[PDB]
Amino acid sequence: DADLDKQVNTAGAWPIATGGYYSQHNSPLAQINKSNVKNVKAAWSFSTGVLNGHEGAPLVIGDMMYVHSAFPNNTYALNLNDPGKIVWQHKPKQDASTKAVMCCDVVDRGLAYGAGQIVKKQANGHLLALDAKTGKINWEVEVCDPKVGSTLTQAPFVAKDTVLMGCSGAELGVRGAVNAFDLKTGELKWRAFATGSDDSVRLAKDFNSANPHYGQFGLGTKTWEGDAWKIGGGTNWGWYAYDPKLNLFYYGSGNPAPWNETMRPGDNKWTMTIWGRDLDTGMAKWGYQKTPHDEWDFAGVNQMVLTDQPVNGKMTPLLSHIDRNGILYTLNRENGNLIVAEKVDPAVNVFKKVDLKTGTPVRDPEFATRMDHKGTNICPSAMGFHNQGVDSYDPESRTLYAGLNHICMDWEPFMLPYRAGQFFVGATLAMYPGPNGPTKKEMGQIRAFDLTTGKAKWTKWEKFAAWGGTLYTKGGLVWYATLDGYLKALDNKDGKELWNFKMPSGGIGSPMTYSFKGKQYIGSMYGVGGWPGVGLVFDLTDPSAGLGAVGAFRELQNHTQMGGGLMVFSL
Amino acid sequence: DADLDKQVNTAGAWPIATGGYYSQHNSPLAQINKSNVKNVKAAWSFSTGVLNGHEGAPLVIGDMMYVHSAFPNNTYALNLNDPGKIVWQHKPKQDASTKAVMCCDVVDRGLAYGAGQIVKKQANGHLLALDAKTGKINWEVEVCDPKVGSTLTQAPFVAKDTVLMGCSGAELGVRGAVNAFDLKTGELKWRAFATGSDDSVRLAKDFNSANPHYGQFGLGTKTWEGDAWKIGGGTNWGWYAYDPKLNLFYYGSGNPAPWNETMRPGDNKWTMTIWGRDLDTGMAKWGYQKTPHDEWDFAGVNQMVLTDQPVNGKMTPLLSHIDRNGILYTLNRENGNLIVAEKVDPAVNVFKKVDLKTGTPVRDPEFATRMDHKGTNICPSAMGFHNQGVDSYDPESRTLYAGLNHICMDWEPFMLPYRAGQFFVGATLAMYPGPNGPTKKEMGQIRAFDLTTGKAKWTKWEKFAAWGGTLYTKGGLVWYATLDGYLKALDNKDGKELWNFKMPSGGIGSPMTYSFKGKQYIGSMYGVGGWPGVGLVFDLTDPSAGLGAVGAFRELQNHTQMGGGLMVFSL
Amino acid sequence: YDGQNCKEPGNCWENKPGYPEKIAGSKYDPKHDPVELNKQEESIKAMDARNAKRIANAKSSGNFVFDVK
Amino acid sequence: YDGQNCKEPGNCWENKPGYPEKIAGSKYDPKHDPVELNKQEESIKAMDARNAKRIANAKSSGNFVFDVK
């Protein structure tokens, strides 16, 4: 809205989880630079009083900082004048059974802000608008229902007078949808489902007019057999982006359900789709299905980054994105045209490649999944070559700094019934390091990409997956947190490590930055969890447990324990 | 042992909870000093992954650091060469019921080290010795039984081949005893009760021979009506001190049970008394009861500080201690002679004073407690003017830097039965700040004392109780952690603040210091709890709840939240 | 099944060798229970009603309150 | 009751004005249950025998085991 744009345009403020409408997650603050980064030290800290993964990052508006925790989703307001004191706090009352329906740790990706309001959700399905000054609740509505396996985890997105919010639960057969709510009243504007009729999917009259081959009308029913689409998945629990000139918003819908591909023949549209939808009506202008008939849980919800760059000399309005499938995608954001569809790592084997003319992946049958068969050495794993991390872009060098995962798996499905409110997966996996690490044990990488060619400038290896993302600050640094507990700073130029600090616990969010009384600060949540840490936060031992994850991160315990908090740094 | 003697003699090691045999809790390290202090900065941190009160401080032996948490009492071994790696960890499997028979948070005051083993306990009553390099369990015995409301919380103490352990539980009517085990095999040596027959209590034939008016033989039962002493309290859950020359160890025994004074006529001996016992036999050499017939829950367990100071210009072996009752006591550690007995704050009103001739508190009826009567404005409160914290001693200026509480109460008792394994308090309280705070609001003070005159050199007021203690380093600084979350460094001369840092959560332990590769580090636990944080920790709203503590600490909630870990600082 | 053989635009699915073209009636028939399949819609429906009662309930008074009937 | 009137050395207790000198038979009689009182003793006896059982079945083998019996 207007208030949001004011904060957006105020230097050193941080009112959007993603960095700005365009989600480049970067910053113009240049107080900390490659030449004085060595001198950065911890400034202050704050504990949330909750355990489990602490994803997201705090918000800064004016001289206030809003922090959030894992379930049960507490919110704390702090005047930067005095971090020692908690101006207001919001502590929801939520039934513990909510946790039983959250697939991947009881996480929360953050808060939103609009119209002098802090917008926050609860895992249990509620969404509220609280005065940013006093914490008084303005409106509170139900969005999802935990009884059918639907919960909330993503950060709300505010644009104009609307708040976008989608529920989680594809692992429990939840049919995904983006819900748009009135910022001032919390009344529902519309809802755009990822499956079913075009009316429910909300497709505009000219949907895919520039790329008829992507598919158009009647496919959210026609690419399924019978009623399977009703519990067809496609939840969007990732990040959003917005182009104010075009009035379009972008996001990816998730994986189809069950995981057992044999139980849902069909392209399963419009799951695994990148969207360009009108903000006011919610009608799709374009739709690109990245992964027809997913056989690997490559949920397509990753962050969307909008950039304006020259392609073959023509300045083009772009959308870039790294999917779980291991493909870096660049499209024209106005029309959905596909420009780049490249492997982020040579180990990607589910596809031989993506045909720019057909616009679909050329499948390698050797790495497919199917009943009565055990697929091995599949890359990427369900966890993907990229997950929920929030990457950064340097507008000057025109590079994206990506936190990738380097994990592969074995998989074999099994038949199961669907019962509402109960898990609907149907697969057994074993996950392990991919093949390219230097000692062949590394599962993370910081990779610098050119978005117009999809070529890597440099690579930095990490023992563990680079789950949270990176931050780019004009001083020429790429900042990130590791699962083993360090916040790091690299030279954007060659990825060389210039600084680091050992935080109490692993970080699974992306770092943020702000100004306060002339000094730039760096903030980072801490507290391992999310999918990588379920073995640790739940004390699992079965390698097969935690959807295959436990076996893969078994050594994380020797480096970190749970936590819950924020650490702020500066010069 | 010789192994501990070695560690104690090594510069920069920290093998004893209290700082050494004498428990002066200080350090000759002077790399950080008054001129330096402003530049100390966080060096690294560690989360235990447990919430609740984090009492005690870690042990440093060679290049290894040993960290401990609240219940379930896990142990983490770290090599100082790379704090990021957890060499070995010990994580007990304990029943969750244990928690319900613990009066003041599921705290743990720490580890002990002896004969190249880590001596550690578990809240559920087990005591163990683990190799310090591998963490392999050498021996495991049972010391207490939670089914009769008996649990472990204090740090083990090691001297020669003996480990001393005492169970907690007087609020559940548990009869206190100091248990002695063989360092090497964990077999029981002797047990010395606080009540009962001379044989159970273990008085030597020369018991109090130098101060016969203190009392001698048979008081264990005559100062009690019937078998009331059988569930008489007197547990020792505080700190110890030891004199290798004399071969005597000292400690305080706790409060008599129930809190309801009218249910247990008598002097209730030998509860609330300072002891001088032979380490080898456990036979009492001297014993002085500070609060005969307790009426306020002033459990007499506080730290014993041994010094060598001039008294009347002659050098004397002293024992010092600030009791919960609000009196600073100085005795001769040799025969138990009363040298000093002064009020730590003029606010103390239970006693007119303590008569050095009769060696008895001159009780004031107006401030006593009895059935059918609600006592009001009683100072100190049950939380006392000094609790569980470990204070320091500057051997040069001969100053003790004390962490005091400034809290008073309202008290009215009530009758109730006794059921082995249930709470036995029988009193209802209301607590509030004492009267001398500069705004009548402060509840804490750091006060410096002369132990031979019992007079105060200076006072620094704090918003909340100074629960954890203080550490003294030769650089001229007094280091302490606060309930509201900061670690502070004061100028020992005047108590002026030189530095502070905002930790994730308030601190309930005392800082420790160590050296690693020629660099001095200050270590502190974080994670508020203990009696003060019960409202915040269990979600209590009732002022009367948490034994009256909830009302007192209502505001803590707006300053900090739970947490659990370690922060290390250095230049 | 390479993904390249399309029946019509946006529909390129093919059965893998030895797997049926249609699942219904096969050894892989999911045999979904319609009563189960309709739960989400019913739930949404009910949720919408409750929420609509709340915004109205406070658009007329000026004080949000969640509890409605 | 000021603490200065001692029947015997180290025994200076006195009833407060209006209170029995002896609790039994009065309205303030705790009426304690003997068997309840002995519960702690029985507990120590037991546990003590367990540890002798633990340490003994170890001085002989060379290998310590807690889960003794």
Ligand SMILES: O=C(O)c1cc(C(=O)O)c2c(n1)C(=O)C(=O)c1cc(C(=O)O)[nH]c1-2
């Ligand atoms: O399909 C879903 O609805 C859904 C939801 C979520 C989530 O909300 O956390 C995750 C996933 N899927 C998922 O596939 C996934 O790999 C994942 C990782 C995490 C996390 O934060 O670590 N959340 C989720």
Ligand SMILES: O=C(O)c1cc(C(=O)O)c2c(n1)C(=O)C(=O)c1cc(C(=O)O)[nH]c1-2
């Ligand atoms: O009577 C006892 O046996 C006993 C035990 C403990 C304990 O172990 O924590 C405390 C107390 N009393 C007690 O009176 C008390 O004020 C207290 C404070 C705390 C704490 O850790 O902060 N523990 C205890």
Ligand SMILES: [Ca+2]
């Ligand atoms: Ca999913």
Ligand SMILES: [Ca+2]
């Ligand atoms: Ca007590």
